[PDB]
Design a protein around this ligand. Structure first.
Ligand SMILES: Nc1ncnc2c1ncn2[C@@H]1O[C@H](COP(=O)(O)OP(=O)(O)OP(=O)(O)O)[C@@H](O)[C@H]1O
Ligand SMILES: [Zn+2]
Ligand SMILES: [Zn+2]
Ligand SMILES: [Zn+2]
Lengths: 179, 128, 379, 169, 375, 92
């Protein structure tokens, strides 16, 4: 019931000095601004927009395949820019997502094939289910399941998400063996 | 490795010089790098760990602001029990305007925080 | 003293909130969603087994008490509005979850009919609950519910949903939108209840008396050569995006005529008012028929009260009621809330009387060392 | 066959195939697959194509005949969207991960929302907002919305991070 | 939490009702050495916080404001928090494009203090009836205590006037097409229970509902099982007592085929720094109600010591019994004779261990673990 | 020259911000010590008022929140005048 031996090709992924595993087909535009500190995984064709802002993810972050993360756009008082989104530690972004969020918190599972709108704030230890749409400028609370097609509150998480999400993403990093 | 790595992704993927150019990036145009002067790079990294030194002081400030607001929840409960016990012992022995001002101040503080919070994210952006 | 909590477990919609307010804090459908079930289940079910109803009611008043009410359970008295002749094992299981699980101070089992009467200041009226399942009439006379003259017919919202499903599968005309834009009759098996009640509260309406009698005569075709009046235009209602169902205009004014179908038993909605009135004592009839209140969530169909008053004034000239209830004046009260929450508004009026609420109710210590709820039946 | 007017920043990582006519002030993001199969594409003034806006002119392949597409003025396509429409108006947004089917005509100023698979043989009326994956649910908007200032920001930041497409005069 | 399919292992709680719960939804009391499920334990209310602006606000202020936030509004179209917008200020939604000018209210010159709900029109009659019936409840109050001791200013309200002719159906319902955008559905109609409008031009937006930080109290000994922190956006609790910080958990990774013999592997994980475990009980002989069993496990082992860190591994190897010994994690092989039914192979077996009560570390608890396979 | 002077401005600005965060930390640690000493003397006063009762049986909120909020506004102030100069130090 925990995660199995997912196998990857040894020539496909580049294992860096700190422990990051990035695929070659993951296009990531403007690599001088993207900061990937811990032992993160960026899967195949995961489009990372390090143009227009700086993307800083946490320690054991799994970005799955064909999912797009990008900064949002905000009309300023004086002069416009793009907000630097800062993904927290131990964040499990699933496949085929669109992320336009600003300040995703730590220890969040983000479910499969979902759209998070512009300047949406994710707080710590929350959860977004599958096939949801979040509207722009929404804040989700801690220990909260947000689901549904307008992105409503649906249910309540267990209180031991902090003792579980570390074990889930560390077992997913340790079950990543090359072929 | 260590707990954090602020070496971006270009300096982590520039070990071979071919994969960052071909696959994961365009990689061109800004081919001119920045000489990491023995002291320019070190005293540039001196800002980069001191901003984390500011961030840990910020989250410990947010830790002790939980404790102060929790202590004032237990001051007034013992005060409300103290007044009820004082009235029982005594019987055994025998501003809207200000509140509105408070509300206004609260709204203003909220606005200030909203401006602050962001502006520190834009100052986080232009530090690099 | 803290304010009381007033809960009415309806069949379709549960009405809930604090006592003394001018309206309910929530109106929700009375369903719960378990893990793995693709459909939500109705929480109120009569003559089913005990522990399943206990678990469903435990999850529903836990959802009700920590999502809409935001308040502790062990602090305040509960006024539980139930129908007259509600089933006794359902009342026993509802008191068992409200005393053994939540451990409240005192529930008070309250009839909906007498605190439908309580919101006007009057003490004697004819009262009619047009609920989801029943259409239950009662006389209340000087604070006494007259139980000898009750009358119930199964002409609630469930019969309207079954009739709407029957005429929609009789004349189904959907457009799929996948090069199937012509008439495609009944490509789905059963229409769900939420879409059926959305068609019923968004499109359907209630015709007049003289139009509805000609609609019944044209459906009868007893030498009526196309003598129907002009129907309303057809309504294109959507289901799940691409499916467009053309609801015909005959359905929108002919699906509600089963409330006023005669069919030689004289059992319609307006006949049980006179059928309850003919068993009354003769000193009560004038100021029982001068005060009619109509409660229940069916009653905010548009034109329903005017059709009911014209059907009462048409049925008074029948010779079965001309000798007894012939020369009567029928008037309808206006309750100060909407007709879904008149029984709730009187329950919230009754819950604010804190001096008598501890004495007119069942204490939790009384439930601890008796275990038996009072009823109107024998003990 | 790629006729790009001057002033329009088009990056090189976007897969552009077939006869297209790119207008004066457009912005094309990376991984933007615009493929012309049966006829040409005409994209007008300032339509900011953003990320995977998959635009396909294979009408006879899926089911003379030139049969082009006309795309108007400030038509922003968001991330992961799927557009297939032989006539399209001006000043109108479609949103992220939406599907537009083949025989949909669009006039000015309408919102197609997130994840609404719409496929009907129907001209969309003026300023109708289709929302939700479940159903369609039109609501009128009284005001046609503007979008200029993000792409006048986006002219100045894209060519120092990306290479540029070829441009005729 | 849901990435591992956490309903595959279930634990039998012991109380008045014996339910099976996953270990993420279980709490362990310390004074009574017994784990407690969520359905057999008591719930409390700590604080009220708005989900849009995450700020705490007290209980009497929530009773004054009728469980509604003072600043945030939910739209009538979807259920999404509206946002203010300048031209001078008006409310608009992000998911649908519902603005504040659809219902027809004017733009407020200030952004927060100008929007308020209309009052109920029949609150004067409701207050007059409440102040009449409280006087009548006092007049019924003074007789029953007088009857009890015998055993041992008037206000009248004008009532409601009934009408002999109610307002009929309008003639524009006949011979006019309805507009489904203009009329409202029942779900957004019943979110305004004071007045339920037919048209969408009379459906004003409501304020945002609040949520509850929940404390949990054990029903045998009244102590806090999980009290959260009062300030929102907090992850740390004031006191937590959760089962995944006290009890050992079993987990599966190796499911072979269902050809009426299997040798599967589990892992036992650890929370204590040093503990002992034993899976030696084979769920007795039809005892303890193992009614969900559909297979037969051998599962025979001696007690295994387990060590967490922040000659026990070299000498007792036993590779058919103990598969691997990492840090705080020991794999154990179980021999299953599965598929006794048509499908849905489940195995019930008991788990004995040791816990520190705080001698006190020799408190031995038996845990009935029912685990399910994919069959 | 210009980049060195520009980020040596930033070292000094972050050093003054790290100074005022520590001064606010000292100023709230003092009032946390005052609150725990005051709730200890109120616990002592409550056991005295419980025991002597057993032997015998044998706009404030406004003002307070207001002071605190004025303090908060002052803090925000000594910040939006500094970071406007930091934001024009972006602008140059
Ligand atoms: N505004 C409305 N207009 C028309 N019909 C409505 C309206 N609101 C609810 N209904 C219908 O009224 C019925 C529910 O009535 P009501 O709420 O009085 O029942 P209940 O209290 O749940 O049930 P019961 O009295 O049988 O316990 C359903 O058929 C529902 O679709
Ligand atoms: Zn709020
Ligand atoms: Zn909305
Ligand atoms: Zn206990």
């Amino acid at each position: 019931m925990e995660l199995g031996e997912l196998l990857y090709n040894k020539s496909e992924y580049i294992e860096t000095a700190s422990g990051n595993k990035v695929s070659r087909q993951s296009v990531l535009c403007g690599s001088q601004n993207i900061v990937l500190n811990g032992k993160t995984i960026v899967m195949n064709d995961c489009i990372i927009r390090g143009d227009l802002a700086n993307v800083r993810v946490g320690r054991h972050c799994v970005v799955k395949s064909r999912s797009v993360i990008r900064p949002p756009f905000k009309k300023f008082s004086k002069g416009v820019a793009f907000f630097p989104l800062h993904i927290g530690d131990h964040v499990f972004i699933e496949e085929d997502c669109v992320v336009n969020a600003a300040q995703i918190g730590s220890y969040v599972h983000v479910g499969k094939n979902c759209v998070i709108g512009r300047r949406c704030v994710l707080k710590d230890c929350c959860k977004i289910l599958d096939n949801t749409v979040l509207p722009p400028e929404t804040v989700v609370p801690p220990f909260t399941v947000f689901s549904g097609c307008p992105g409503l509150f649906s249910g309540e998480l267990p209180e031991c998400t902090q003792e579980l999400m570390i074990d889930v993403t560390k077992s997913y990093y340790q079950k990543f063996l090359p072929l | 490795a260590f707990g954090i790595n602020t070496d971006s992704l270009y300096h982590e993927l520039s070990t071979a010089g071919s994969e960052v150019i071909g696959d994961v990036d365009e990689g061109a145009d800004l081919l001119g790098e920045f000489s990491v002067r023995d002291d320019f790079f070190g005293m540039g990294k001196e800002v980069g760990n001191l901003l984390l030194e500011n961030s840990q002081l910020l989250e410990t400030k947010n830790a002790l602001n939980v404790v102060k607001n929790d202590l004032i929840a237990k001051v007034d409960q013992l005060s409300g029990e103290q007044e009820v016990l004082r009235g029982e012992l005594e019987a055994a022995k025998q501003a809207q305007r200000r509140r509105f001002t408070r509300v206004e101040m609260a709204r203003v503080l909220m606005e200030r925080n909203q401006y602050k919070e962001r502006l520190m994210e834009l100052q986080e952006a232009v530090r690099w | 003293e803290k304010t009381a909590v007033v809960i009415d477990l309806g069949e379709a919609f549960t009405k809930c909130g604090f006592a003394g307010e001018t309206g309910p804090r929530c109106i929700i459908p009375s369903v719960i969603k378990k893990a793995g079930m693709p459909k939500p289940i109705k929480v109120v079910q009569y003559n089913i087994n005990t522990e399943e109803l206990y678990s469903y009611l435990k999850e529903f008043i836990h959802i009700l008490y920590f999502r809409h009410l935001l308040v502790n359970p062990r602090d305040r008295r509960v006024v539980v509005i139930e129908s007259v002749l509600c089933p006794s094992h359902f009342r026993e299981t509802l008191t068992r979850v409200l005393f053994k699980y939540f451990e409240v101070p005192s529930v008070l089992l309250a009839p909906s009919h007498l605190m439908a009467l309580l919101t006007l200041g009057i003490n004697s009226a004819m009262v009619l609950d047009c609920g989801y399942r029943e259409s239950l009439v009662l006389p209340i006379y000087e604070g006494i519910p007259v139980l000898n003259c009750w009358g119930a017919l199964p002409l609630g919202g469930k019969a309207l949903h079954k009739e709407l499903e029957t005429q929609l599968l009789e004349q189904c005309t959907v457009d799929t939108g996948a090069a199937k834009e012509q008439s495609l009759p009944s490509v789905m098996g059963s229409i769900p209840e939420g879409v059926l009640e959305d068609i019923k509260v968004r499109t359907c309406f209630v015709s007049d008396l003289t139009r509805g009698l000609k609609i019944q005569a044209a459906k009868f075709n007893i030498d009526g050569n196309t003598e129907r009046p002009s129907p309303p235009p057809n309504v294109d209602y959507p289901l799940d995006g691409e499916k467009i169902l053309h609801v015909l205009g005959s359905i929108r004014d002919s699906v509600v005529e089963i409330l006023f179908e005669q069919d030689n038993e004289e059992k319609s909605v307006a006949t049980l008012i006179l059928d309850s009135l003919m068993q009354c004592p003769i000193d009560t009839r004038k100021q029982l028929a001068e005060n009619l209140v109509i409660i229940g969530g069916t009653s905010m169909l548009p034109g329903f009260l005017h059709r009911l008053l014209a059907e009462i004034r048409y049925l008074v000239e029948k010779p079965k009621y001309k000798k007894t209830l012939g020369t009567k004046t029928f008037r309808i009260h206006t309750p100060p809330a909407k007709a879904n929450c008149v029984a709730w508004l009187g329950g919230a009026i009754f819950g604010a009387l804190q001096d008598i609420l501890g004495s007119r109710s069942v204490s939790k210590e009384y439930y601890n060392q008796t275990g038996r709820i009072p009823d109107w039946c024998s003990l | 066959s790629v006729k790009i007017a001057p002033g329009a920043v088009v990056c090189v990582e976007s897969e552009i195939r077939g006869d297209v006519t790119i207008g004066p002030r457009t912005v094309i993001h990376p991984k933007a697959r615009i493929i012309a199969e049966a006829g040409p594409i005409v994209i007008g003034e300032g339509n900011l194509i953003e990320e995977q806006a998959l635009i396909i002119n294979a009408h006879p392949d899926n089911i003379s005949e030139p049969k082009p597409m006309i795309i108007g003025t400030n038509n922003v396509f968001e991330v992961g969207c799927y557009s297939q429409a032989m006539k399209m108006g001006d000043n109108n947004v479609i949103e992220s991960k939406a599907y537009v089917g083949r025989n949909v005509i669009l006039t000015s100023g309408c919102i197609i929302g997130a994840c609404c698979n719409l496929n009907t043989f129907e001209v969309i009326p003026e300023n109708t907002v289709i929302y939700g994956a479940d159903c369609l649910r039109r609501v009128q908007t009284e005001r046609p919305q503007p979008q200029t200032l993000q792409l006048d920001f986006l002219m100045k930041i894209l060519p120092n991070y990306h290479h540029l497409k070829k441009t005729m005069k | 939490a849901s990435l591992l399919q956490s309903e595959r292992v279930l634990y039998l709680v012991q109380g008045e009702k014996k339910v099976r719960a996953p270990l993420s939804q279980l709490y362990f009391c310390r004074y009574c050495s017994e784990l407690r499920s969520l359905e057999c334990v008591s719930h409390e209310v700590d604080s009220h916080y708005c989900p849009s602006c995450l700020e705490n606000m007290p209980s009497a202020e929530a009773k004054l404001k009728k469980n509604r936030c003072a600043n945030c509004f939910d739209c009538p179209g979807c259920m999404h928090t509206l946002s203010t917008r300048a031209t001078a200020y008006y409310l608009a939604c992000g998911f649908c494009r519902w603005t504040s000018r659809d219902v027809g209210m004017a733009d407020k010159s200030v952004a927060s203090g100008g929007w308020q709900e209309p009052d109920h029109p029949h609150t004067q009659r409701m207050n007059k009836l409440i102040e009449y019936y409280q006087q009548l409840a006092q007049k019924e109050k003074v007789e029953r205590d007088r009857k009890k001791l015998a055993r041992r200013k008037e206000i009248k309200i004008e009532p409601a006037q009934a009408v002999d002719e109610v307002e009929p159906l309008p003639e524009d319902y006949y011979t006019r097409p309805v507009n489904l955008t203009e009329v409202t559905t029942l779900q957004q109609r019943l979110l305004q229970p004071d007045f339920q409008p037919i048209c969408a031009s009379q459906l004003y937006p409501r304020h945002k509902h609040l949520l509850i930080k929940r404390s949990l109290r054990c029903r045998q000994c009244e102590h806090n099982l999980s009290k959260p922190e009062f300030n929102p956006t907090s992850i740390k609790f004031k006191i937590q007592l959760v089962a995944v910080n006290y009890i050992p958990e079993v987990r599966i990774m190796s499911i072979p085929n269902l050809r009426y013999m299997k040798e599967s592997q589990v892992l036992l994980t650890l929370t204590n720094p040093v503990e002992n475990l034993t899976h030696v009980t084979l769920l007795e002989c039809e005892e303890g109600d193992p009614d969900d069993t559909n297979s037969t496990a051998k599962v025979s082992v001696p007690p295994t010591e387990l060590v967490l860190a922040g000659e026990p591994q070299d000498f007792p190897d036993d590779p058919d019994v103990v598969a691997f010994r990492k840090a705080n994690k020991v794999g154990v092989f179980i021999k299953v004779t599965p598929q006794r039914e048509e499908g849905d192979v489940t195995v019930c077996f008991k788990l004995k261990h040791d816990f520190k009560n705080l001698g006190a570390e020799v408190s031995w608890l038996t845990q009935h673990v029912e685990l399910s396979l994919g069959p």
